[PDB]
């Protein structure tokens, strides 16, 4: 009834007419391609709700490859959602009663959507007898597309091309003779690394244009010297961003257990917080191709740099220089002494004094974690981490239990980058990745300095500095309690954020958090060393 | 190996294409000069790493003077470095051990660079028998040059003319 209200109660002149984003984006892409030599390598497919059962207007970019007499086609999907109303809340079932759970754009992309996209793709190429089709990636575009958006169209086309080419390589490299990156290609040169700590001002941005939290940035490069002319230069390969968080983890001495030992050393009785590093993004700089092997290289570089003389604690020390603020580490003074009720100002202390203060409350080790988006530019690449979490398929075994395929893929990548040394260092079948079970929102809000900031700025330190202790307890509890379902944790965190920000923010997507096994990481570093690879950090102080 | 990584692992559409600063700057200077009466007093020489052993793309502005039957030529050198990666640190030897010392753009302009620039200048005028060449100045341009940079080109041309004279 209400869907056709405008046709019933109609008016001649209307203020809302809508736009044609799919027509605008397709026109820009074809205009860019019309002058190069790749005019015939791409096919553009338009899917709209007027003829297919889809929720949003989408565009599909397709390309093919031929082996023998067969054709294989791969597609990249782009839903465009600018100008639509946001999704409403869904009522679910809980142990006590009913709760209302937030949703965002990605929650509508179910199996029906995939089936419809596949049918459209098959109609595009001619039929089932004309080849085979597969989906190679997915990304949601939340910003409007006009006739003056050439740069965005070019960037999106480049991302689609890289994803399609990588899929073709992984699936048919042996038959097509396509190589892949490994550490043997860096044998005759000298790798280097650098780190930057910046927390005031603008942040990093994604392909659409939304901010990303970038407290720590690490760059991996290659050093070159001319033989006879003695010129010096460098070539920049890959970059990584992230930040430092805290996890409550008290030690229980009263259980008649042994003291907690870190690196074989005991810790003071007042230590109760565990530092954690969260990776937010990774992207190439001067490399044209970005594959899983390149991601492994970035991971190795970041781990080597962050442990070079406790270089990660420099982030907290640098943050302490601003004084009272949302990222002040002096809020831990309230943890140390209960009577203290106001965060401490440490802007007049020397670096060693601050280091000594931190040593009384923090564990001297680092936890490595990563945020995996459910859709985005590189979600197709990063989905391999969740796939390796389940080691064994429960399939009946004649003797030895069967091992899953995602675990095999991750293990194979680790072994191939290091030329077969990882296999000799680490046992086949031991864990590589753990799941925490927390679903994290993605979005942005308006900062008081005039810029848009990542919603991931709300963490434990923010709550300690800005709110009261009850809110701190609730936040930590939703992160740690094991008797809470996923939806309950999502609801608790959403409520706290909404109260703090007065409801002035926008949500764009979801992400899940995973962490690595420390033994596996140590074996990976050792295997990389055994393959002839060394790195020289250039910026580390003290 | 790693220098040609893009050719090995290639992609059809690339996000980084580079620019043509030497073509843009030379075009602006010639456009400014085309209406005055000094059209034939200047020679522009382009030196690029693809054919000469130089670290950066450079442009040379030349002018001449004749005494007796001999010709004398003087040049002003302009390396353009906008858009390149900064130099890495160099390891040196100290009384205690090794130290890493910062470098900047000028540290790469050694005697080899001077020899290459002189060879390009001599090829421009015709040969050793057509005159003599000398370098009259040098300046590094660290800001990008586009098709809307007429003022900067005019100022640079004026500086080169004063130095040569």
């Amino acid at each position: 009834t209400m869907r056709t209200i405008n046709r019933t109660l109609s008016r001649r002149i209307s203020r809302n007419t809508g736009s044609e984003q799919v027509l605008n984006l397709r026109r820009l892409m074809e205009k860019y391609l019309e002058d190069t030599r790749f005019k015939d390598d791409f096919i553009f497919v338009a899917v709209d709700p007027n003829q297919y059962s889809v929720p949003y207007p989408t565009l599909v970019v397709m390309s093919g490859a031929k082996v023998g007499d067969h054709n294989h086609f791969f597609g990249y999907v782009l839903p465009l959602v600018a100008g639509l109303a946001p999704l409403p809340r869904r009522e679910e079932q809980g142990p006590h009663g009913n709760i209302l759970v937030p949703r965002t754009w990605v929650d509508n992309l179910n199996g029906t959507f995939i089936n419809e996209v596949m049918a459209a793709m098959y109609a595009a190429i001619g039929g089932k007898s004309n080849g085979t089709a597969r989906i190679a990636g997915l990304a949601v575009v939340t910003n409007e597309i006009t006739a003056e958006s050439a740069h965005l169209a070019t960037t999106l086309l480049s991302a689609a091309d890289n994803a399609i080419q990588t899929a073709i390589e992984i699936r048919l490299g042996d038959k097509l003779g396509l190589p892949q990156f490994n550490l043997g290609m860096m044998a005759s040169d000298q790798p280097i690394s650098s780190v930057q700590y910046n927390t005031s001002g603008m942040q990093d941005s994604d392909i659409v244009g939304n901010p990303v939290r970038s407290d720590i940035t690490v760059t991996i490069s290659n050093r070159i010297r001319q033989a006879m002319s003695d010129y010096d230069s460098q070539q920049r390969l890959v970059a990584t961003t992230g930040y430092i968080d805290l996890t409550y983890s008290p030690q229980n001495p009263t259980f008649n257990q042994g003291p907690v030992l870190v690196n074989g050393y005991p810790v003071p009785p007042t230590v109760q917080y565990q530092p954690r590093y969260v990776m937010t993004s990774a992207y190439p700089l001067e490399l044209d191709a970005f594959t899983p092997n390149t991601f492994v290289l970035g991971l190795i570089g970041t781990i080597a740099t962050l442990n070079s003389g406790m270089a990660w604690a420099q982030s907290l020390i640098s943050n302490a220089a601003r004084g009272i603020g949302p990222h002040n580490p002096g809020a831990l003074a309230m943890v140390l002494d209960p009577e203290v009720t106001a965060p401490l100002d440490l802007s007049t202390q020397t670096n060693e004094q601050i280091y000594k203060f931190l040593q009384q409350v923090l564990y001297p080790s680092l936890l490595i974690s990563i945020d995996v988006p459910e859709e985005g530019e590189y979600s197709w690449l990063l989905r391999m981490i969740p796939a390796a979490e389940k080691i064994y398929t429960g399939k009946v075994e004649g003797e030895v239990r069967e091992i899953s395929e995602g675990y095999k893929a991750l293990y194979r990548a680790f072994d191939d980058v290091t030329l077969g040394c990882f296999s000799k260092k680490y046992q086949y079948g031991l864990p590589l990745v753990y799941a925490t079970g927390n679903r994290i929102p993605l979005g942005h809000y308006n900062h008081q300095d005039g810029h848009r900031h990542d919603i991931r700025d709300m963490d434990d330190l923010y709550m300690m500095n800005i709110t009261n202790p009850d809110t701190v307890e609730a936040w930590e509890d939703s992160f740690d309690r094991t008797d809470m379902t996923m939806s309950q944790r999502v609801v608790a965190r959403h409520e706290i954020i909404d109260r703090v920000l007065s409801g002035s923010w926008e949500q764009t997507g979801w992400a899940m958090r995973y962490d690595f096994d420390p033994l596996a990481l140590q074996a990976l570093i050792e295997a990389a060393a055994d393959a002839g690879f060394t790195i020289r950090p250039e910026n580390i102080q003290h | 190996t790693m220098r040609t990584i893009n050719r090995t692992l290639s992609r059809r559409i690339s996000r980084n294409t580079g620019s043509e600063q030497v073509l843009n700057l030379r075009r602006l200077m010639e456009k400014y000069l085309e209406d005055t009466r000094f059209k034939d007093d200047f020679i522009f020489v382009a030196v690029d790493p693809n054919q000469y052993s130089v670290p950066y793309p450079t442009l040379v502005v030349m002018s001449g003077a004749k005494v007796g039957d001999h010709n004398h030529f003087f040049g002003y050198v302009l390396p353009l470095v906008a858009g390149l990666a900064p130099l890495p640190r160099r390891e040196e030897q100290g009384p205690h051990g090794n130290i890493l010392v910062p470098r900047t753009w000028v540290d790469n302009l050694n005697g080899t660079f001077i020899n290459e620039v002189m060879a390009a200048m001599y090829a421009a005028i015709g040969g050793k028998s057509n005159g003599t060449a000398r370098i009259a100045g040098l300046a590094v341009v660290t800001n990008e040059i586009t098709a809307e940079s007429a003022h900067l080109a005019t100022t640079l041309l004026s500086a080169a003319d004063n130095a040569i004279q």
Binding site: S249, N263, S308, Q522, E526, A529, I535, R536 | -
Partner: peptide, 25 residues
């Protein structure tokens, strides 16, 4: 019960091999 996360402490990475770093000279 008891608050806190007990598994987080055991997953911390303490130190790595020194052979990954470039030797002086």
């Amino acid at each position: 019960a008891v608050r806190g996360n007990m598994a987080a402490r055991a997953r911390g990475l303490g130190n790595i091999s020194g052979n990954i770093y470039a030797r002086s000279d």
